[PDB]
Amino acid sequence: GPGSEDDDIDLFGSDNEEEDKEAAQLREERLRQYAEKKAKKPALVAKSSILLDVKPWDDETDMAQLEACVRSIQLDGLVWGASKLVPVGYGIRKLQIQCVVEDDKVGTDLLEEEITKFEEHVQSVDIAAFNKI
Incomplete structure (x- = not known):
């Protein structure tokens, strides 16, 4: 329907459109990027504050880069x-990182999936506590 000033009529020769399989996917990809990078209006949006503990493999595993993995x-x-x-056990000390997610955009999915990929440096990702804000 109506989006950015128009809805479906061509008044703009700046857009090539194209009727192609990859083009169709890319058209939709434009909307994804607009919905993701824009449309994020500050209001009373629900938030969660999750305390995850990033536990390293060994002392050799650097604690700061553990934080770096999560912070990127x-x-x-x-x-x-x-x-x-x-500090918890022999050698192993866990890094507790607080993450604040805007629920109407970012679910815990993103953080849970990403940090478990970071398990190349992280031994295991433990949940310390979940808090709502």
Whole structure:
């Protein structure tokens, strides 16, 4: 229907459109990018604050790069809070990272999926606690 000023009529020769299989996918990809990078209006949006603990494999595993792995997750509405190290066992100390997610954009999916891929440096990803804000 109506989107950006028009709805379906061609008044703009700046867009080539094209009727192609890959083009169709790319047309939709344009909307995905607009919905993701834009449409994010600040309002009373629900948020979750999840405390995950990033546990390293060994002392040799660097704690700062553990934090770096989590802090490089780029999603609009994925906010990082304070992180602290909690010493637990022999050698292994866990990094507790607070993440604040804007629920109407970013689900925990993004953080859960990404940090479990980061398990190349992280031994296991444990959940410390879940809080709503």
